[PDB]
C-alpha cells in the first residue's frame, strides 16, 4: 500500500507500559495503519527513525488551556513538549458551560476575563475549538465552580437543593455532548463552602462510565488525609473513578507525608478505582501573598510591580538587603509573584513513581512569569527523571503520559501506538530529550523532541516550527 508516513527502524514505546521493540510504523490518513518488523511500502514521506523512540502523543491531563488554546491555536508551550492532547477544565474551573452573570469568581480568572466566557454549552465550546484550528487536540472536563456560578446567586455557602438539581441537569447535558467528567477545586474560597453531599450529587452524573471525577482536594496541607477520604467517599457514593489532581504534600509540616497518602491510596484502591496526576517539580509558583510568607524555605521573587529589580532574589535576601522583616519585605514587593520551595523532592519522586500516577503540567498560560512546568513537564519526566535519575524505565515514563492517561479519561483510540488508533505520535531522542524551561527562563522549548504528529499531520519538528493545525475537539468514548 501507498502510505502517507513511514517511520523506519524506530524503538516503539507503545504507551501500555509493556516492553519496547523495534519496528516500522506506517500512517495513512489520521490512523496508524501498520506495525511490523519491517514495512516494504511506498510512502509519501519516510523518516529514518534509527536511534529514536516513537511514542504516542503525550496527553496533558491537567491543563488550564481552556481559552488560551483557542486564542493561540499554534499552542507551542505544549506542542514543543510532545503534547498532542490537552485536557482542559480542571480544578473546578472550565470555560465550557460557564456563563458570567457578573464578576468572574476566583480562580476562573486563571483562564480569562468575563468577556472570554462565551461557551454556554460543551457543544458551543467544541465548535469554537475547531473553528480555531488548533495544533493539538482538546478535551474538556466540566468545572464544578463554574457550575456553582451558573446556578447560585452567591458562592460562599452550601448550595440548596434547587441549585444542586439544576447543576445535575447541566452537567448531564455536558457529558452527553462529550465532556470527560467533572473537576472540583474545593480548596478555593468559591467552592470551599460546598458540602460533600453537593459534590456527591454531581459525581452521580458520572456513573456507568459517563466520566471521571477529578479533584483539587479540599486541602493539600495538614488535613490532606481527611480531604483524600472525602474524595474517595464521593467516588464510592456515585460509583465513579477518582483522579486526585496535582497530588502533593505542601508545606514544611507535611514533608514526607506522601508515605501516608500513598498508603491510603493503596488501601482504598482495593475497593474502588483511584488514580492521580502530579507535576514533576518540588517548587510551586504563585502570587506573593502575606499568608504564605515563611522562613522555612526559599521564596524566590519572579516579578514585582513595586520593585521590579528584586526579581530572582529570595525574600530573605531582599529582607536582609533592606534590613526589614520578611513580612515587611513582602509588603514592599507587592504586587509580586513568587516561587515557593514548599514541597520535598522525595515526596514528588514517591508520587511520580506511584503506579497509577499520570503526568500533568498544571501549566498556567496567562501567568506573566510562568512556572516552567508549562513548557517542560513532559520532557522533564522522560529525560531528567527516567533517563538521568532512573526513577522508572522509559516505557513506564511514557506509559504515565499516554496509555494510562487515555484509559483513565476514556479517550477513544488514543494514547497507544497501535494499529487502528489515531496517529498522534512523538519521535524523540531518548539520550537528549530534556526540559530546557527553567524558573529564571521558563518559556523555552524542550530539546530532543524530533517530530510531533497530530491526527496523521506532521505538526512540529527539531527546527522548533509549528507546521500543522490538525487538532480536534475530543469527545468521551461513548460506551
Ligand atoms: Ni488545582
Ligand atoms: Ni489546576
From TrEMBL:
Residues 45-459 form the Amidohydrolase domain. GO terms for molecular function: N-acyl-D-amino-acid deacylase activity. Pfam families: Amidohydro_3. It comes from the Bacteria. InterPro entries: Amidohydro_3, D-aminoacylase_insert_dom_sf, Metal-dep_hydrolase_composite, Metal_Hydrolase, Metallo-dep_Hydrolases_sf. Keywords: Hydrolase. CDD domains: D-aminoacylase. Its EC number is 3.5.1.-, 3.5.1.81. This is Amidohydrolase family protein. It comes from Klebsiella pneumoniae. The lineage of its organism: Bacteria, Pseudomonadati, Pseudomonadota, Gammaproteobacteria, Enterobacterales. The gene is dan.
Amino acid at each position: 500500500m501507498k502510505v502517507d508516513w513511514l517511520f523506519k527502524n524506530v524503538t516503539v514505546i507503545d504507551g501500555s507500559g509493556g516492553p519496547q521493540y523495534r519496528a516500522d510504523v506506517a500512517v495513512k490518513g489520521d490512523r496508524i495503519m501498520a506495525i511490523a518488523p519491517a514495512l516494504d511500502v511506498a510512502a509519501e514521506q519516510v523518516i529514518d527513525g534509527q536511534g529514536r523512540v516513537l511514542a504516542p502523543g503525550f496527553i496533558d491531563v491537567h491543563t488550564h488551556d481552556d481559552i488560551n488554546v483557542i486564542r493561540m491555536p499554534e499552542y507551542l508551550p505544549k506542542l514543543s513538549q510532545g503534547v498532542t492532547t490537552v485536557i482542559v477544565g480542571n480544578c473546578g474551573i472550565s470555560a465550557a458551560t460557564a456563563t458570567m452573570r457578573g464578576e468572574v469568581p476566583d480562580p476562573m480568572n486563571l483562564l480569562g476575563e468575563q468577556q472570554h466566557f462565551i461557551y454556554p454549552t460543551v457543544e458551543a465550546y467544541a465548535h469554537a475549538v475547531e473553528a480555531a484550528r488548533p495544533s493539538l487536540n482538546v478535551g474538556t472536563l466540566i468545572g464544578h465552580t463554574a457550575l456553582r456560578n451558573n446556578h447560585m446567586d452567591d458562592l460562599f455557602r452550601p448550595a440548596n437543593e434547587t441549585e444542586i438539581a439544576g447543576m445535575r441537569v447541566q452537567l448531564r447535558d455536558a457529558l452527553r455532548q462529550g465532556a470527560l467528567g467533572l473537576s472540583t477545586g474545593l480548596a478555593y474560597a468559591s467552592a470551599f463552602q460546598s458540602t460533600t453531599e453537593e459534590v456527591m450529587a454531581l459525581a452521580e452524573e458520572l456513573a456507568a462510565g459517563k466520566g471521571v471525577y477529578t479533584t483539587h482536594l479540599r486541602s493539600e496541607f495538614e488535613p490532606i488525609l481527611e480531604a483524600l477520604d472525602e474524595a474517595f467517599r464521593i467516588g464510592r457514593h456515585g460509583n465513579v473513578p477518582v483522579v486526585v489532581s496535582h497530588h502533593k504534600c505542601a508545606g514544611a509540616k507535611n514533608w514526607g507525608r506522601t508515605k501516608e497518602t500513598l498508603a491510603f491510596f493503596d488501601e482504598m484502591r482495593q475497593q474502588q478505582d483511584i488514580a492521580c496526576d502530579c507535576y514533576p517539580y518540588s517548587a510551586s509558583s504563585s502570587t506573593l501573598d502575606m499568608k504564605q510568607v515563611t522562613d522555612e524555605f526559599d521564596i524566590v521573587i519572579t516579578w514585582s510591580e513595586a520593585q521590579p529589580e528584586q526579581a530572582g532574589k529570595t525574600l530573605q535576601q531582599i529582607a536582609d538587603e533592606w534590613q526589614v522583616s520578611l513580612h515587611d519585605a513582602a509588603a514592599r514587593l507587592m504586587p509580586a509573584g513568587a516561587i515557593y520551595h514548599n514541597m520535598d523532592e522525595q515526596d514528588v519522586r514517591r508520587v511520580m513513581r506511584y503506579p497509577v500516577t499520570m503526568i500533568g503540567s498544571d501549566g498556567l498560560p496567562n501567568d506573566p512569569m510562568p512556572h516552567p512546568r508549562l513548557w517542560g513537564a513532559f520532557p522533564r519526566v522522560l529525560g531528567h527523571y527516567s533517563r538521568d535519575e532512573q526513577l522508572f524505565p522509559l516505557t513506564t515514563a511514557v506509559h504515565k503520559m499516554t496509555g494510562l492517561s487515555a484509559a483513565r479519561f476514556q479517550l477513544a483510540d488514543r494514547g497507544l501506538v497501535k494499529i487502528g488508533y489515531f496517529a498522534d505520535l512523538v519521535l524523540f531522542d531518548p539520550q537528549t530529550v530534556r526540559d530546557v524551561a527553567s524558573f529564571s527562563d521558563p518559556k523555552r522549548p524542550a530539546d530532543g523532541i524530533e517530530a510531533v504528529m497530530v491526527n496523521g499531520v506532521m505538526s512540529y519538528g527539531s527546527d522548533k516550527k509549528i507546521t500543522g493545525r490538525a487538532g480536534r475537539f475530543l469527545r468521551r468514548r461513548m460506551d
